Chains A and B, each alone.
Chain A
Amino acid sequence: LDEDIIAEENIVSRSEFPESWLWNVEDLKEPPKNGISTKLMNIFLKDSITTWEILAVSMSDKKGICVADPFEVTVMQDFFIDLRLPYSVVRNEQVEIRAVLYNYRQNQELKVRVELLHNPAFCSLATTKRRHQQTVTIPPKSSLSVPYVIVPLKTGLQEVEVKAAVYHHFISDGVRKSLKVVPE
């Protein structure tokens, strides 16, 4: 807790991954200039690491409707985790989720201590007391896959969470995804 690394105490995961958002309504009441009202908008990007596509339509009784072109915005990171959960698991069947660790650093391998957090509602090598970590090496410009086998223990909506930190840097990610548990 004094090593060249970030602490699980201090990792705040990403969790907010909408599939669509900013379903908002703004009004060009600004002072027209050269005929073109201009609004500046303050938006907060959501946690997902992807490319957002923003679509605007304008309606004016003078000039009508107007499907603005699409406009792309890419949120990314040099290192992060992809927690690939499937749509739904069945309570009490054993599966294997994969944590994919991406390292898009130019030129140096990364050493990570990645860790599946304990969840009472799941049967994992992770206990209230003992944690479940490996320590792994990702080449640069590529991906390391990290198996975690688990067993869902309660129906309804359950939550898997992984955290990883790189050594010597102070980079860290953590994802909190949720999957449907269904009874047999």
Chain B
Amino acid sequence: SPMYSIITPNILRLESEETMVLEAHDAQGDVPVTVTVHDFPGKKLVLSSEKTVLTPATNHMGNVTFTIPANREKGRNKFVTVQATFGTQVVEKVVLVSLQSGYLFIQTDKTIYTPGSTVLYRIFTVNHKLLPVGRTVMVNIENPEGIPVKQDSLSSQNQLGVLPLSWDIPELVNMGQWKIRAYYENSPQQVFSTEFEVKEYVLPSFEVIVEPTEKFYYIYNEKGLEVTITARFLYGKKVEGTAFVIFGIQDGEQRISLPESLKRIPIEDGSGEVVLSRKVLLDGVQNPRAEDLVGKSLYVSATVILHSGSDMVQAERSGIPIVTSPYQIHFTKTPKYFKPGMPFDLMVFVTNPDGSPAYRVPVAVQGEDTVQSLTQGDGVAKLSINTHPSQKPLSITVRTKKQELSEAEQATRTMQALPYSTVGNSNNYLHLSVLRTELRPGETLNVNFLLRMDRAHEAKIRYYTYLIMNKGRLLKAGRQVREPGQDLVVLPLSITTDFIPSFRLVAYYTLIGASGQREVVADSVWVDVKDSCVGSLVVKSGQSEDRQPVPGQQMTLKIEGDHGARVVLVAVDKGVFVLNKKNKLTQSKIWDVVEKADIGCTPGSGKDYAGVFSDAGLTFTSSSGQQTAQRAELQCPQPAA
């Protein structure tokens, strides 16, 4: 009995290419297929042009490339209807679409301007693949009470995705945090914003940096919070002066200063030592069961003065956590579903209090004493447990195990993983065990394909069908062949830069078995690719070797980047950043925009065959009617903890 399957992204997008996988399972000879999208509900025939045939050459696997226009069509999600007709047979599914065009990033020359100093800004404009596209953009400049004081409307057509711009700050105007907002003329709701402060300032001639010996304070730490103050001119040179330091406690957004913690220390040879004592910190509140102070944060303001009296600088390290344990423990990179009997790969996430990944930290589970595993440079630890073939929820609890910490000082956390719920409770499973390290484009990743089923229908399974999500779109969809008696097959996955920052892998097979029942068994896995520019960009020095240049002197600048690329330059007196270092552009900031835009909401797997598919950004609709829970929510499941 032939079966045709349709596989698409969970949520489509306007004015961009999407892809969907056509498959002919168990059919003979060439099968011609026509695919058509219609507005919903009714008929507009928004895209029909595409036709294709599934040759026995290419194991009946199809390629769908299409671009949905943006015709004259709210608050209620709009959809579309993908209709794929193999020969005469006609399968179709009802999916969600978004007006979200892509992304927008804004760059300002400085982080902070004075009244009457012009602000330069660039709007980088791109699609969901972070490729430069050309649309029309609107750009507002709100003052600090939110009122647009200027807008323009600009097109990025033939501008290689880069819109230069400026705005002359008026002479009198409110100081405060201004904002630049921009959206695609197609989709007003997805707005983009960067800020910039407007203040009156002269630039400072050094930077000041405050630092706790620990990234947190331990409540039972008799020594109190120790802090090293550091000053050095912008031209790199050490500072002499005296510096006033003072502390406080934060609760939520609420801030209490400890007036008594005020200390005046000498800043000698660019550095100084100073401390909040446990006593002041408690008196300062009022000696409540110290335990009470748990969860709140500390902060230190330092203010240096040069001995010349010429120039002052403030600076503050904020929200240092008050904690009973140094480390935190997270299961949000570990799936929430295992396969009974099969080894479960645990991705424990171990953050310092602040939020930073903690390196080389040991972890293990409740039960077994011998099992240990450190944390690679990504604050990640790979532990694998062999599970029992029992239809019982598997509760795991992990716990730190650092020598030199007391068992009370160690940190734990618990999660609950449910078994994969098969079809007709047949006990047929698929596992993808993937060696887990820092993957890098070029490196080759092995995907262990492990088959779990009674040899009865084992000979039947001939092939695995695999797919790759990335930046929420299909990046590849292929087949992995299998021969009877095999439970393990290994997939050579070349890893190119197109995989960054992270890609999803969903493999599924299908068969008839038990009692004439049409089945689908599957598995989804998330893997970080070590983030970094997709091409490259570097700006080193021109003169291979040299002494410091001199005011007004010629210097040669070297730029190593992708052929034909456009570079946009700016150099900024680092003295600015001592007044404001916020709202700068980072590539890391972009990767962060791209992940929060993932349509896949789970680290791995599915509750059922049909979950694996909706968890990664996907839908599976087959002739035999086995489709996936249709998706009609734009965002992922509102966090339920």
The residues of A with any CB-CB pair to B shorter than 8 Å are 14, 16-30, 32, 35-69, 71-77, 80, 82, 84-88, 98, 100, 104, 142-145
A41 close to B202 (CB less than 8 A):
no
A60 close to B535 (CB less than 8 A):
yes
Contacts A22-B571, A57-B585; A36 near B561 (Cβ below 8 A): yes
Which residues of A are found within 8 Å of B550, using beta-carbon distances? 45, 75-77
Instruction: Tell me the chain B residues, 277-298 only, with Cβ under 8 Å from chain A.
Output: none
Which segment of B218-226, B485-493, B574-582 sits at the interface?
A: B574-582
The residues of B with any CB-CB pair to A shorter than 8 Å are 105, 107, 109-110, 114, 117, 120, 122, 124, 126, 129-132, 160-162, 164, 200-203, 205, 234-237, 240, 306-311, 497, 533-542, 548-577, 585-590
A180 CB, nearest partner CB in chain B, Å: 9
Which residues of B are found within 8 Å of A44, using beta-carbon distances? 552-555
Which residues of A are found within 8 Å of B164, using beta-carbon distances? 25
Contacts A40-B556, A46-B552, A54-B557; A66 near B132 (Cβ below 8 A): no
Contacts A37-B561, A100-B308; A65 near B569 (Cβ below 8 A): no
A74 close to B551 (CB less than 8 A):
no
Which residues of A are found within 8 Å of B553, using beta-carbon distances? 44-45, 75
B590 close to A67 (CB less than 8 A):
yes
B472 CB, nearest partner CB in chain A, Å: 15
Contacts A19-B110, A20-B571, A42-B556; A60 near B205 (Cβ below 8 A): no
Question: Which of A30, A50, A80 has the largest count of B CB atoms less than 10 A from its CB?
Answer: A50
CA distance A22 to B549 in the complex (A): 17
Partner of B129, one of A16, A64, A145: A64
CA distance A55 to B570 in the complex (A): 6
B561 close to A28 (CB less than 8 A):
yes
A99 CB, nearest partner CB in chain B, Å: 9
CA distance A37 to B558 in the complex (A): 11
Which residues of B are found within 8 Å of A16, using beta-carbon distances? 552
Partner of B538, one of A22, A45, A46, A68: A68
CA distance A101 to B115 in the complex (A): 30
B105 close to A77 (CB less than 8 A):
no
A57 close to B567 (CB less than 8 A):
yes
A39 close to B568 (CB less than 8 A):
no
Q: Which B-chain residue is minimally distant from A39 (CB atoms)?
A: B559
Q: Which A-chain residue is minimally distant from B575 (CB atoms)?
A: A50
- Pull 26 A–B residue pairs with CB atoms less than 8 Å apart, ordered by A: A17-B573, A19-B573, A25-B164, A25-B566, A25-B567, A37-B562, A38-B558, A39-B558, A50-B573, A55-B569, A55-B570, A58-B535, A59-B161, A59-B566, A63-B497, A64-B130, A65-B161, A67-B590, A68-B533, A75-B548, A76-B235, A84-B205, A98-B308, A100-B310, A144-B308, A145-B308
A53 close to B567 (CB less than 8 A):
no
Which residues of A are found within 8 Å of B560, using beta-carbon distances? 36-38
B537 close to A61 (CB less than 8 A):
no
B570 close to A40 (CB less than 8 A):
no
Q: Which B-chain residue is minimally distant from A55 (CB atoms)?
A: B570
A53 close to B549 (CB less than 8 A):
no
A22 close to B570 (CB less than 8 A):
yes
Which residues of A are found within 8 Å of B590, using beta-carbon distances? 65, 67
A51 close to B235 (CB less than 8 A):
yes
CA distance A15 to B130 in the complex (A): 42
CA distance A87 to B202 in the complex (A): 6
Partner of A67, one of B309, B533, B571: B533
Question: Which of A37, A56, A88, A100 has the largest count of B CB atoms less than 10 A from its CB?
Answer: A56
Question: Which of B308, B541, B555, B585 has the largest count of A CB atoms less than 10 A from its CB?
Answer: B308
Contacts A39-B559, A63-B562; A50 near B110 (Cβ below 8 A): no
Partner of B235, one of A50, A59, A64, A142: A50
A53 close to B577 (CB less than 8 A):
yes
B551 close to A75 (CB less than 8 A):
yes
Which residues of B are found within 8 Å of A19, using beta-carbon distances? 110, 117, 203, 572-573, 575-576
CA distance A53 to B588 in the complex (A): 18
A54 CB, nearest partner CB in chain B, Å: 4
Q: Which A-chain residue is minimally distant from B159 (CB atoms)?
A: A59
CA distance A64 to B370 in the complex (A): 47
Partner of A55, one of B237, B541, B556, B572: B572
Q: Which A-chain residue is minimally distant from B113 (CB atoms)?
A: A19
A59 CB, nearest partner CB in chain B, Å: 5
Contacts A45-B549, A66-B533, A82-B205; A58 near B574 (Cβ below 8 A): no
A40 CB, nearest partner CB in chain B, Å: 6
B74 CB, nearest partner CB in chain A, Å: 30
Partner of B564, one of A29, A51, A53, A86: A29
CA distance A32 to B564 in the complex (A): 9
Which residues of B are found within 8 Å of A69, using beta-carbon distances? 538-539
Which residues of B are found within 8 Å of A55, using beta-carbon distances? 569-572, 585
Q: Which B-chain residue is minimally distant from A99 (CB atoms)?
A: B310
Contacts A64-B131, A74-B236; A49 near B551 (Cβ below 8 A): yes
B536 close to A36 (CB less than 8 A):
yes
A50 close to B124 (CB less than 8 A):
no
CA distance A68 to B586 in the complex (A): 8
CA distance A61 to B156 in the complex (A): 13
Q: Which A-chain residue is minimally distant from B131 (CB atoms)?
A: A64
Q: Which B-chain residue is minimally distant from A146 (CB atoms)?
A: B308
B551 close to A14 (CB less than 8 A):
yes
Which residues of B are found within 8 Å of A68, using beta-carbon distances? 533, 537-539, 561, 567
* Cβ-closest 8 pairs across A and B: A63-B535, A67-B587, A68-B537, A41-B557, A20-B109, A60-B565, A32-B563, A50-B234
Which residues of A are found within 8 Å of B236, using beta-carbon distances? 51, 74, 76
B456 CB, nearest partner CB in chain A, Å: 50
CA distance A147 to B33 in the complex (A): 87
Q: Which A-chain residue is minimally distant from B240 (CB atoms)?
A: A142
CA distance A48 to B561 in the complex (A): 29
Contacts A61-B132, A142-B240; A66 near B202 (Cβ below 8 A): no
Contacts A54-B539, A71-B540; A25 near B234 (Cβ below 8 A): no
Which residues of A are found within 8 Å of B240, using beta-carbon distances? 142
B308 close to A43 (CB less than 8 A):
no
Which residues of B are found within 8 Å of A67, using beta-carbon distances? 533, 537, 585-590
CA distance A22 to B569 in the complex (A): 6
Partner of A49, one of B235, B307, B308: B235
B570 close to A21 (CB less than 8 A):
yes
A47 CB, nearest partner CB in chain B, Å: 5
CA distance A29 to B565 in the complex (A): 8
B202 close to A61 (CB less than 8 A):
no
Partner of A20, one of B114, B554, B562, B570: B570
Contacts A44-B554, A50-B574, A67-B587; A61 near B548 (Cβ below 8 A): no
CA distance A18 to B203 in the complex (A): 11
Which residues of A are found within 8 Å of B559, using beta-carbon distances? 26, 28, 38-41, 56
B202 close to A28 (CB less than 8 A):
no
Which residues of A are found within 8 Å of B557, using beta-carbon distances? 40-43, 54
CA distance A77 to B105 in the complex (A): 38
Which residues of B are found within 8 Å of A104, using beta-carbon distances? 237
Which residues of B are found within 8 Å of A49, using beta-carbon distances? 235, 551
Which residues of B are found within 8 Å of A88, using beta-carbon distances? 200
B571 close to A66 (CB less than 8 A):
no
